[PDB]
RNA sequence: CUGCAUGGCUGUCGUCAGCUCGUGUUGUGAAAUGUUGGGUUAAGUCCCGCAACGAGCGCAACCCUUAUCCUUUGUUGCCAG
């Protein structure tokens, strides 16, 4: 009884063997994805993302493509969402305990 | 006597831009990345960039001298009124 959102077929190869488990087959050489290996995982994805937000968890979005470079910057006044829209800084997550000096250099503004 | 057994004290490349630490990444490791590259500089200097982000020392400056205007003043130097 489950159904796909918008999918009917998407891309050729352009390959990674690790993605084969999600791919049900092909339609005129273009690949089609398996409902049972994508839909339950996508249902969980929006459930767990909301659970982290209910636990006051800090959310980061990446919008590094032009039609998203401004939409990524806000999730309405009733919300809290961090962003990257164009460019990165090396170690800004794993070396954040040093890049906090770079953040202070901008908080100084 | 022995500074090729030593503390202290003093040269030279050179006043050349170079020597390191914390963190994150890499490699089995030595170590690299950083500190290389690009434009630029007196220069690891100043901009740019990239898995590197920052910091410490040297480097510029702080020490010494001299060049000018403006204002007030002075011995045994000066002399416009």
Q: Residue by residue, what is the 3-state secondary structure of chain A?
A: CCCCCCCCCCCCCCCCHHHHHHEEEEECCEEEECHHHCHHHHHHHHHHHHHHHHCCCCCEEECCCCCCCCHHHCCCCCCCCEEECCCCCCCCCCCHHHHHHHHHHHHCC
Q: What are phi and psi of A75, to 5 degrees?
A: -115, 30
Q: What are phi and psi of A46, to 5 degrees?
A: -75, -20
Q: CB under 7 Å from any atom of strand B: which residues?
A: A 87-91, 94-95, 97-99, 101-102, 105
Spatial distance from the CA of A96 to the C1' of B16 (Å): 37
């Amino acid at each position: 009884m489950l159904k796909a959102g918008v999918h009917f077929g998407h891309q050729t190869r352009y390959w990674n063997p690790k993605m084969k488990p999600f791919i049900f087959g092909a339609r005129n050489k273009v690949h089609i994805i398996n409902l049972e290996k994508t839909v339950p995982m996508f249902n969980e994805a929006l459930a767990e993302l909301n659970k982290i937000a209910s636990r006051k968890g800090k959310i980061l979005f990446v919008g590094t493509k032009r039609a998203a470079s401004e939409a990524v910057k806000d999730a309405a006044l009733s919300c809290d969402q961090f962003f990257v829209n164009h460019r990165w800084l090396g170690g800004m997550l794993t070396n954040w305990k040093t890049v906090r000096q770079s953040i202070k250099r901008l908080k100084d503004l």
